[PDB]
């Protein structure tokens, strides 16, 4: 940390708290996350634990690097590589104009390829949303905070008190499943995908019910045929108002055909039929993708 | 989603390599033994009950502390805090939560503090240089298992037993990767309870033959024939719940057909 002067705080969290600062010797500009640490009690909280394991494993250009770690008697560190806003700050500064549809595009691209990087290496993120992804001047993205993330190598189990978002959580959570898989990565994905597009939140439920709801409001109530097995998931009720889906030129107005369709495969109900990142990749939503720079 | 499925196991043997310990350490250790190491296994199989965790944090923990042993020398009256801090780093990376510090004080019996725990909790990382997402013979199992025609929870069950039952003793088990004594656990347990043979699915897969496999499947039949009688029991208790069909009740096979 001697080589290291503070510059000024950029986020506070459950993490931690992120400074940006400079290395006084080489110049360059990192992230220092903090790691909160209760010598005395607790120790090493899981989520740093989790997030040094696994980022170190992960070397691709849309996931955040980790260059170092710095663990003394009081405190512990990560240096991260800086990137100067996250996504959730771009849509709020865009709200109005609206991100550029190709800008959108490049990001989903490049997140797409994050994703497929650490699902091939049995690591699950379960947390995207926006405030996750992180931004730079030269058009990149990058998937940020793997505090929650897990690896797979043996099913990660579910959490009985799910502490991990609302608006962003896939249906088969939300409707008791036991296990986790790489599916709800992409069903996050695909709500911010949406939420670029027509700049806003596309299931901002105020509630686990209500958020349910809201994902059964847009895409139809699911029954054993677009779903098989829905019926005797641990939480759902045959009580559940029937909805129709809707017609997606509706949802989001601004996509073409291909965009529409990449997103209903994103957004497919049963976790055994969503599209994985891999395919998505394939998609020809992405036959014309170029890289933009975002006006920060 | 089975996108993924090779890739994975590809990289997980990749990974295995990397998180080896050294097979000879306990003779370069001065003040402990296998019969120690077995001792401290046990127990964690014990608090693994107690707490109910879940096996993976077994082998993780296990993992973690031959590797820390690979490098550190540690007295015999110190094996069991570095066993506490393994299982409580062990629990971190792999439960939704862990058992707290202070449970982890009151299964050693009271015989550490809570800042002795920490501290070592801060010295295992730094040694294991915070690389906890190690390979297991229960995550290649797991993987194996998708292969099975049809599935048979016996063999499941029975192969998970062995699997556990080799934590005990590095005295052979340290001198094989986790995905070989996988396959050795995976045949011996489809064996025992039908008689068929390590598939052609996971000889493809793997790339181990049967052939390749019996270095390991031999001490494994050892090992299972001699359990009984072991001097450490408490992966046999587990494994008589009905949660496990009873499987370390099953007789054992007297010969292999090798
Ligand atoms: C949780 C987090 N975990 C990590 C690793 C974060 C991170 C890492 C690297 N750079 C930035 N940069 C950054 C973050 C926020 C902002 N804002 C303007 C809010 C700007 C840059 N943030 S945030």
């Known amino acids: ?296 | 989603v089975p996108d993924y499925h090779e890739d994975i196991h590809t990289y997980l043997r990749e990974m295995e390599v990397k998180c080896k310990p050294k097979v000879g350490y306990m003779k370069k250790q001065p003040d402990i033994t296998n019969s120690m190491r077995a001792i401290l296994v046990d127990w964690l199989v014990e608090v693994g009950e107690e707490y109910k965790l879940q096996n993976e944090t077994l082998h993780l923990a296990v993992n973690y502390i031959d590797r820390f042993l690979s490098s550190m020398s540690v007295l015999r009256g110190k094996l069991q805090l570095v066993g506490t801090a393994a299982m409580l780093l062990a629990s971190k990376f792999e439960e939704i939560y862990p058992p707290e510090v202070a449970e982890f004080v009151y299964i050693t019996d009271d015989t550490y503090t809570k800042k002795q725990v920490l501290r070592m909790e801060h010295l295992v990382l730094k040694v294991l240089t915070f690389d906890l997402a190690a390979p297991t013979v229960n995550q290649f199992l797991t993987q194996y298992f998708l292969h099975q025609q049809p599935a048979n929870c016996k063999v499941e069950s029975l192969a998970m037993f062995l699997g556990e039952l080799s934590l005990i003793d590095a005295d052979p088990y340290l001198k094989y990767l986790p995905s070989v004594i996988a396959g050795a656990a995976f045949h011996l347990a489809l064996y025992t309870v039908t008689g068929q043979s390590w598939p052609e699915s996971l000889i493809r897969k793997t790339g181990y033959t049967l052939e390749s496999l019996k270095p390991c499947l031999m001490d494994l039949h050892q090992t299972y024939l001699k359990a009984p009688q072991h001097a450490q029991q408490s992966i046999r208790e587990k494994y008589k719940n009905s949660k496990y069909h009873g499987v370390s009740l099953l007789n054992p096979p007297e010969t292999l057909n090798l």
């Open chain 1, 1 to 296: 940390m001697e080589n290291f002067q503070k510059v000024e705080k950029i986020g506070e969290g459950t993490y931690g708290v992120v400074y940006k600062a400079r290395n006084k010797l080489t110049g360059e500009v990192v992230a220092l996350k903090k790691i909160r640490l209760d010598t005395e009690t607790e120790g090493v909280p899981s989520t740093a634990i989790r997030e040094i394991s696994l980022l170190k494993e992960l070397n691709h250009p849309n996931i955040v690097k980790l260059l170092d770690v710095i663990h003394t008697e009081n405190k512990l560190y990560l240096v991260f590589e800086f990137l100067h806003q996250d996504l959730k700050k771009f849509m709020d500064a865009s709200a109005l104009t609206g991100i550029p549809l190709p800008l959108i595009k490049s990001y989903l691209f490049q997140l797409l390829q994050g994703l497929a990087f650490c699902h091939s290496h049995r690591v699950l993120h379960r947390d995207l949303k926006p405030q996750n992804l992180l931004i730079n001047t030269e058009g990149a993205i990058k998937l940020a905070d793997f505090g929650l993330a897990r690896a797979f190598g043996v099913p990660v189990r579910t959490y009985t008190h799910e502490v991990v978002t609302l608006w962003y959580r896939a249906p088969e959570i939300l409707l008791g499943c036991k296990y986790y898989s790489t599916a709800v990565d992409i069903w996050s994905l695909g709500c911010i995908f949406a939420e670029m597009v027509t700049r806003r939140a596309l299931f901002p439920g105020d509630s686990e019910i209500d958020q349910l709801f809201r994902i059964f409001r847009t895409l139809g109530t699911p029954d054993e045929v677009v779903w098989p097995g829905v019926t005797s998931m641990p939480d759902y009720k045959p009580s559940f108002p029937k909805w129709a889906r809707q017609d997606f030129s509706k949802v989001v107005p601004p996509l073409d055909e291909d965009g529409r369709s990449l997103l209903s495969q994103m957004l497919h109900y049963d976790p055994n039929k969503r599209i994985s990142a891999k395919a998505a990749l394939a998609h020809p939503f992405f036959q014309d993708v170029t890289k933009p720079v975002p006006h920060l």
